[PDB]
Amino acid sequence: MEHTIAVIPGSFDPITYGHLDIIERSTDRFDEIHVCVLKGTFSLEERMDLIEQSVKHLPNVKVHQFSGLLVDYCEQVGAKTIIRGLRAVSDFEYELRLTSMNKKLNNEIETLYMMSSTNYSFISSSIVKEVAAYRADISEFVPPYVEKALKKKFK
Ligand SMILES: Nc1ncnc2c1ncn2[C@@H]1O[C@H](COP(=O)(O)OS(=O)(=O)O)[C@@H](OP(=O)(O)O)[C@H]1O
């Protein structure tokens, strides 16, 4: 096993414990992990900062951004794996299109799906921002820094 790099894509708007769980479960399986923000409630720089403060405890996790094909990013940084989470509330056909296309564009990159834990298998950033907008207790869905920002925004 040479030096392995895995990219965990998303628009992380914002990053939730759901995403965070996938990142943490991945750190010990690749030498290098890149959380890449591609393609909104929070600005791009805002979202990177939120991810950053949320993964300070994970030394091998980098936070970068990219505009363009995710596969081009992977080819640039030498990443050969794309990590995606599979949840009960996932859009299966959407995942099929997305991943099948990435495979066509560059098959030297494998997308690996990790199934979400039962407690995060039902949330998404949308539903979370929604209840946050109505000032519900959201400490269960997002890390401290993110919750602080969401509240700040939806005050
Ligand atoms: N691991 C995990 N846990 C919980 N939720 C997750 C996870 N990964 C992706 N998502 C949510 O799936 C929706 C689409 O993801 P993205 O907007 O990042 O697009 S992309 O497919 O990742 O490119 C989007 O939620 P929506 O708010 O319903 O659009 C992402 O926040």
Curated annotation (Swiss-Prot):
Q: What does this protein do?
A: Reversibly transfers an adenylyl group from ATP to 4'-phosphopantetheine, yielding dephospho-CoA (dPCoA) and pyrophosphate.
**Stated name of the protein:** Phosphopantetheine adenylyltransferase
**Superkingdom per UniProt:** Bacteria
Record comment: activity regulation: Is inhibited by a series of cycloalkyl pyrimidines, which also show suppression of bacterial growth.
GO CC list: cytoplasm
Residues annotated as binding ATP are 11-12, 19, 85-87, 95, 116, 120-126
Species lineage, top-down?
Bacteria, Bacillati, Bacillota, Bacilli, Bacillales
| UniProt source species | Staphylococcus aureus (strain MW2)
Q: Which InterPro entries does the record associate with it?
A: Cyt_trans-like, PPAT, Rossmann-like_a/b/a_fold
Can you tell me which residues bind substrate? Answer: S11, L70, R84
Q: How is it used?
A: PPAT is a validated novel target for antibacterial therapy against Gram-positive bacteria.
Q: Pathway, per UniProt? A: Cofactor biosynthesis; coenzyme A biosynthesis; CoA from (R)-pantothenate: step 4/5
Could you tell me the keywords of this UniProt record? ATP-binding, Coenzyme A biosynthesis, Cytoplasm, Magnesium, Nucleotide-binding, Nucleotidyltransferase, Transferase
